[PDB]
């Protein structure tokens, strides 16, 4: 070789954080997920690697309706999808489970599941 | 109480990101520099350039440079996705110079260095 070659190890972790900031904000958002009444917004491109239940319903602003979901559950997957983290209380894990079920997230569904089967 | 962190699921979706940039797949910037036609995503680049940041607060986006090397353009768009940078020896001035039209600094830092440890 002999040329420039540099990973910036910081970079990734700072620009989730923004992305994050961003979500919150809702600035860019191009997708309004309604989650029985109350509403998210974010980006279809992260949830399209997230989720390849949303990949399949964006490949066709997005309009997307859930009148089951509990609302603080698609919080929780959302911020999973922008920090790769996922926080819940002992009483939400039951409805993130179905809500990663749901959105097709197999990786939370089965940190979730075996949450609860373990009790 | 129940969390947990996927240290997998980052590096599977800036591939899949990256992925999608290639693809041409839920873009909403088009990236016009003399001639070259390339796309991404507002809230990756947004992200990024604090140029480009302030553009997108003014139908999908449309921006051109025709001052800019192209191949170096493609460069910094693989940074911004994939945290690296990746460029040969003759192309890092042109690097350099598209780094600072979009107010990129680490990519400015790192590149000058360079430059600057070779005249």
């Given at each position: ?81 922008y920090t790769a983290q996922l926080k819940a209380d002992k009483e939400l894990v039951k409805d993130v489970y179905s809500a990663a079920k749901k959105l097709k997230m197999d990786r939370v569904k089965q940190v979730c ?7």
């Amino acid at each position: 070789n002999g040329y420039l070659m540099f990973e910036d190890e910081n970079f990734i972790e700072s620009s989730v954080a923004k992305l994050n900031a961003l979500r919150k904000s809702g600035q860019f958002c191009d997708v309004r997920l309604q989650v029985c009444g109350h509403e998210m917004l974010a980006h279809r491109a992260v949830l399209a690697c997230c989720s390849p239940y949303l990949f399949e319903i964006f490949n066709s602003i997005s309009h997307v309706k859930f009148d089951d979901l509990n609302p603080e559950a698609v919080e929780v997957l959302l911020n999973y999808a922008y920090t790769a983290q996922l926080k819940a209380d002992k009483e939400l894990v039951k409805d993130v489970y179905s809500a990663a079920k749901k959105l097709k997230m197999d990786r939370v569904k089965q940190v979730c599941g075996d949450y609860l089967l373990s009790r």
